[PDB]
Design a protein around this ligand. Structure first.
Ligand SMILES: NCc1cccc(N2CCCC2)c1
Ligand SMILES: [Ca+2]
Length: 223
């Protein structure tokens, strides 16, 4: 997150870190067994780390649970990033509590102008690199479809939305991928891609979760 703020420990209780020896993507806990992330974060050997704040220090609220199964969306295209969503099932159920909690799925899509909370452990510089230990947060509005399309001609599908600031300065970045965009208490986006970070006229692009709710529900119901 570039141009964000320190969230505060465990204030984003659905945020998980995907770990394969190191943090490499965010995700969002959606029930005691299942996490939502980006399909471009797929790999084998994922350990899900819940209850994190400082990802380099054991602080006392963590739960570390290995993945039993990963399901990339059936229509994910890794060249266009269309349908950039996957589900990860945990080998054991998380203990839910005030610091480790699921985030509700939307029941309708959100509108442009809706404020959201974007969070993660990704790069905090728009030029250069610096990776934080503790979780960073950014409040950002959803941008109109039309301004998203004009910012990225030919690349925005109906399964994507832009959020952030056309002036640049405040955005998601490398290492935030797969994490949440929560708007009025619902998971509306997944951190997906952008051209660089926090550049003028290049806002972040997010997987449009409301399009996927019946796939997520039916997948969980049968797996
Ligand atoms: N600025 C949005 C965004 C979110 C996630 C990743 C990325 N990229 C990764 C490499 C450079 C930008 C961008
Ligand atoms: Ca920790």
């Amino acid at each position: 997150i570039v141009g964000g703020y320190t969230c505060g420990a465990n204030t984003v209780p659905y945020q998980v870190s995907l770990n394969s020896g190191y943090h490499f993507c965010g995700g969002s806990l959606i029930n005691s067994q299942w996490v939502v992330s980006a399909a471009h974060c797929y790999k084998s050997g994922i350990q899900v780390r819940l209850g994190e704040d400082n990802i380099n220090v054991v602080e006392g609220n963590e739960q570390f649970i290995s993945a039993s199964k990963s399901i990339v969306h059936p229509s994910y295209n890794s060249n266009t990033l269309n349908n950039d969503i996957m589900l990860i099932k945990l080998k054991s159920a998380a203990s839910l509590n005030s610091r480790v909690a699921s985030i509700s799925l939307p029941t309708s899509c959100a509108s442009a102008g809706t404020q959201c909370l974007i969070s993660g452990w990704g790069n905090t510089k728009s030029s250069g690199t610096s990776y934080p230990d503790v979780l960073k947060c950014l409040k950002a509005p959803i941008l109109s479809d039309s301004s998203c399309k004009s910012a990225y001609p030919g690349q925005i599908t109906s399964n994507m939305f832009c959020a952030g600031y056309l002036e640049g300065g405040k955005d998601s970045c490398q290492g935030d991928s797969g994490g949440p965009v929560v708007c009025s208490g619902k998971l509306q986006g997944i951190v997906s891609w952008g051209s660089g970070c926090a550049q003028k006229n290049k806002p972040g692009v997010y997987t449009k979760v409301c399009n996927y709710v019946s796939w997520i529900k039916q997948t969980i119901a049968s797996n």
